[PDB]
Amino acid sequence: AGGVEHQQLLDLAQKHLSSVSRVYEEDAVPGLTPCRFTGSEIRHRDDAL
Amino acid sequence: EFGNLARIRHVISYSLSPFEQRAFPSYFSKGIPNVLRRTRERILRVAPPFVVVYLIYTWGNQEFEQSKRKNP
């Protein structure tokens, strides 16, 4: 963001970060599963505060 | 009145929503042993006076019935 040009940034990005992996180690995709929201409470009682 | 009853430090409490949990979670399977345990803890303090006064009641009724009878 700011005083940059997209083509110069693309040329630098290619020439530097063209060797980032894209290939998996164990070929097992880490899924980003849904999370279960739980209605509950937590109460830490500290009267010295 | 709430807020000035006691001084409590380093205590954490965890709960659930009443809509998030079962009403009767393992009711019989955890309720029959616990009721049996409370019964085992309290029968030797509660029951024997009542057994003794049961015998007093039965003895008094039979002694009243025998005193009703005409002695030959």
- B11 - beta bridge partners? A45
For residue A47 the two structure tokens come to: 């009267």
- The answer to whether residues B21 and A39 touch, using CB atoms and an 8 Å cutoff, is no
Chain B positions touching A48 (Cβ under 8 A) are 9
Contact: A44, B12; criterion CB under 8 Å: yes
Contact: A39, B10; criterion CB under 8 Å: no
Tell me which residue range forms the domain holding B66: 1-72
**Element spanning B11, H or E:** strand B11-14
Chain B touched by A45 (CB under 8 Å)? yes
Number of domains in chain B: 1
- The answer to whether residues A41 and B15 touch, using CB atoms and an 8 Å cutoff, is yes
Q: What is the DSSP letter of B71?
A: P
Chain B residues contacting A via beta carbons under 8 Å: 7-17, 19-20
Q: What is the resolution of this structure in A?
A: 3.3
- Distant-in-sequence contacts of B7-10, Cβ < 8 A, 24+ apart: B7/A47, B8/A45, B8/A46, B8/A47, B9/A45, B9/A46, B9/A47, B9/A48, B10/A46
For residue B68 the two structure tokens come to: 């009703």
Q: Residue holding tokens 């029968």?
A: B43
* Alpha-carbon A28 to chain mean position: 18
Closest CA to A48 of B4, B13, B8, B2: B8
Chain B touched by A36 (CB under 8 Å)? no
